């Protein structure tokens, strides 16, 4: 049996698996009422990707495809409909057992980024280009990636071409005010209104009493307005990548991991790493975790459902 | 001795180490007259990062720091000076044995991206983001001295003394004025000061061999062009080699580009100690090979091993 391992990466060497951001802090929120069921950054400990999770850090909340036309505006700004392809360029296939094309955002909000286009040229033989700031509202009824198309809006009023290769590079959020509907635990309706999501990665929760979810938190940029919005992922993208490479069989439902100083080897705190790919800790306190960023999780042993964690 | 390995990732599961882009194609250019000495995506086979190379995909061509003031500049747009910190938040330190802060762009050009700010609050912070351009050929581009200059279309809404982040997106232009050359290093300390602590240049030693690159096509803000960025190894290899730290048992590892399911070899390449690939190819341009394939380590070989033509 191939021994289970975690990569040797300190907190400042990790990236968020739900948005292209470095990990800033570890974080807990025991009193969260929402169901935690994110679809990016989902990977079992034995290497099975779930939800909309894919391997590329550049693929997280990214879109690839083609603008079909300008569309009448439901909100302020100029609006465009784009069909989406898979990130690897292959055609959109609705029959795929996934919630949406891999990399599709898994939370409600106005995602801010840049739309860029490079025209095709069938033979001075150099394609025309354009790029503009764009916003994708994932709560909108026009957000239907599982049906093969989404909608984005621009400040630019005319300079977006139809029928040309189109890329969305995510940067952050457009806003976090009431109208912007930012909720990191509210899944988009991937197939739009009056149609339910399918093939979802399962919800996660601490089964053990006195335990809470431990998150890898990143603070996400804002185009404007007031706020300090954050994105919490269950595991960093590097873990997803590592677990996928190793595919080590899970010898139990829970892996005991210790957050350790890289040179001494001394334990700072311990956590449970569950089979479906998430962490729990024994913590009554909420908020950012006070711990050195110069530390990493090290696998200790497989334990049973009854193992009790030291408080942190 | 820990056995050397490569990760099992097909071409469509790889990321460029010199710009935040997926790998699009394998590429060769035998008649390249330029010296290849890029500083990002540099890692020895036994796991030693070099140049400005760091582990984070979000760190590549990214900047973190603080805007000091608006500045005057002869080119178009509104211009801003920002101090740069290390990407992990640690202070800029000129004595670190690196060419520049890790993640600093390693090529000449106008890099297009978004400058974003979140204000500190010593007591909900105000935020702003704008399109920005960083000209790495500019004399004001001095990251090794701890500060750079970016320009915006926005004329006023950039705050001084606040946490500032640059998210790279692509290039502003590739016309003559834009000075895009992916093999021309910036002057990290500006004019009249030479670059230091560089990762070494790479070249095929063997006759009939050429460098093999992982190519990504980079977005353009405007204008005509199909610019590309070539890296020696994808970011995932850099990350993998760093984790493994497997001892190099010779100066060259024989690797085969293989179909993932059958295991059949499509072509072979030399993976050199300093972290780059060569192949026996006379042709230039994209390599015609399925993206559904990956490099698999075969064995360590000596200096006289001859590659099959591809």
């Amino acid at each position, epitope marked *: 049996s191939k021994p289970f391992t975690l990569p040797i990466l300190t907190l400042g060497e990790l990236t968020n698996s739900r948005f292209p951001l470095p990990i800033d802090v570890l974080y807990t929120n025991p009193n969260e009422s929402a169901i935690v069921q994110c679809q990016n950054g989902r990977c079992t400990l034995d290497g099975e990707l779930q939800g909309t999770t894919q391997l590329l850090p550049t693929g997280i909340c990214a879109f690839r*495809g*083609k603008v079909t036309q300008q569309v009448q505006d439901e909100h302020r700004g100029t609006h465009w409909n784009m*069909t989406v*392809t*898979n990130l*690897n*360029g*292959t*055609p*959109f*296939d*609705p*029959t795929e057992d996934v919630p949406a094309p891999l990399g599709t955002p898994d939370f409600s909000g106005q995602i801010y980024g840049v739309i860029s286009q490079r025209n*095709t*040229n*069938t*033979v001075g*033989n150099l*394609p025309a280009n354009r790029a503009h700031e764009a916003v994708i509202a994932t709560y909108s009824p026009k957000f239907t990636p599982k049906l093969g198309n989404i909608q984005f809006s621009t400040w630019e009023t005319q300079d977006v071409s139809s*029928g040309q*290769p189109t890329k969305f590079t995510p940067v952050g959020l457009a806003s976090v005010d009431a109208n912007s509907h930012f909720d990191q635990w509210t899944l988009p309706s991937y197939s739009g209104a009056l149609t339910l999501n399918m093939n979802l990665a399962p919800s996660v929760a601490p089964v053990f009493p006195g335990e809470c979810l431990l998150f890898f938190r990143s603070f996400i940029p804002l185009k404007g307005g007031y706020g300090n919005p954050a994105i919490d992922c269950l595991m960093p993208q590097e873990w997803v990548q590592h677990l996928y490479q190793e595919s080590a069989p899970s010898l139990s439902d829970v892996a005991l991991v210790r957050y350790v100083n890289p040179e001494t080897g001394r334990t700072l705190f311990e956590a449970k790493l569950h089979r479906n790919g998430f962490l729990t800790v024994a913590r009554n306190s909420a908020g950012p975790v006070v711990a050195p960023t110069n530390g990493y999780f090290r696998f200790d042993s497989w334990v049973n459902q009854f193992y009790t964690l030291a408080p942190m | 001795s820990k056995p050397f390995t490569l990760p099992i990732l*097909t071409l*469509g599961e790889l990321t460029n180490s010199r710009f935040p882009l997926p790998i*699009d*194609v394998l590429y060769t250019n035998p008649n390249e007259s330029a010296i290849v000495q890029c500083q990002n995506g540099r890692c020895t086979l036994d796991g030693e990062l070099q140049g400005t190379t760091q582990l984070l995909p979000t760190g590549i061509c990214a900047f973190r720091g603080k805007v000091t003031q608006q500045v005057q500049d002869e080119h178009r747009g509104t211009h801003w000076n920002m101090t740069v910190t290390n990407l992990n938040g640690t202070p800029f330190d000129p004595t670190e044995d690196v060419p520049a802060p890790l993640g600093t762009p390693d090529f000449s050009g106008q890099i297009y991206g978004v400058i974003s700010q979140r204000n500190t609050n010593t007591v909900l912070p105000a935020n702003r983001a704008h399109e920005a351009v960083i000209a790495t050929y500019s004399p004001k581009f001095t990251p090794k001295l701890g500060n750079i200059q970016f320009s915006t279309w926005e004329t006023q809404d950039v705050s001084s003394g606040q946490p500032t982040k640059f998210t790279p997106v692509g290039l502003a232009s590739v016309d003559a004025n834009s000075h895009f050359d992916q093999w021309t290093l910036p002057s990290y300390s500006g004019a009249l000061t030479l670059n230091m602590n560089l990762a070494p240049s790479v070249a095929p030693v063997f006759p009939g061999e050429c460098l093999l690159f992982f190519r990504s*096509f980079i977005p353009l803000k405007g204008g005509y062009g*199909n610019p590309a960025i070539d890296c020696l190894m994808p970011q995932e290899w850099v990350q993998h080699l760093y984790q493994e730290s497997a001892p190099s048992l010779s100066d060259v590892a024989l690797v085969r580009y293989v*179909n993932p399911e059958t295991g059949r070899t*499509l072509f072979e390449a030399k993976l050199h100690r300093n972290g780059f690939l060569t192949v026996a190819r006379n042709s230039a*341009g*994209p390599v*015609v*090979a*399925p*993206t*559904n394939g990956y490099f698999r380590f075969d064995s360590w070989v000596n200096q006289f091993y001859t590659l099959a033509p591809m």
Partner: nanobody, 132 residues
């Protein structure tokens, strides 16, 4: 990204005809099979026709055999799909891709549920609508 470009899709009445073009965008068509595929609304990607690198050997899905003709014009870096006697069931987005697996003589039309990533240079597609 380097990709094929497909065009010539439009609206047509049943029994009508259309010529689709699969063109190389930037690069030059090399010696490998080129395939035409289609994706009808709510349905998976399916193989339609292919032509060998030589351009002398072709294969067709049973659905379009006798009605469709695929041809290769390497001089113009374009592969053509001549669609005759169109049926309303032919309504779909049409795609072309290259088979880079074995750089054989006779084409292979992949069975349904095939892995699309086994093929390369997928284009953005062209819409073919055959009214009723």
């Amino acid at each position: 990204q380097v990709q094929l470009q497909e065009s010539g899709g439009g609206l047509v009445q049943p029994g009508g005809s259309l010529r689709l073009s699969c063109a190389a965008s930037g690069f030059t068509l090399g010696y490998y099979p080129i395939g035409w595929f289609r994706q009808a609304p709510g349905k998976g990607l399916e193989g339609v026709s292919c032509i060998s690198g030589s351009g002398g050997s072709a294969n067709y899905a049973a659905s379009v055999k006798g009605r469709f003709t695929i041809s290769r014009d390497n001089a113009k870096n374009t592969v053509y799909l001549q669609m005759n006697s169109l049926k309303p069931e032919d309504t779909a987005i049409y795609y072309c891709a290259a088979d880079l697996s074995s750089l054989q003589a006779m084409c292979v039309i992949p069975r349904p549920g095939f892995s699309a990533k086994a093929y390369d240079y997928w284009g953005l597609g062209t819409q073919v609508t055959v009214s009723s």
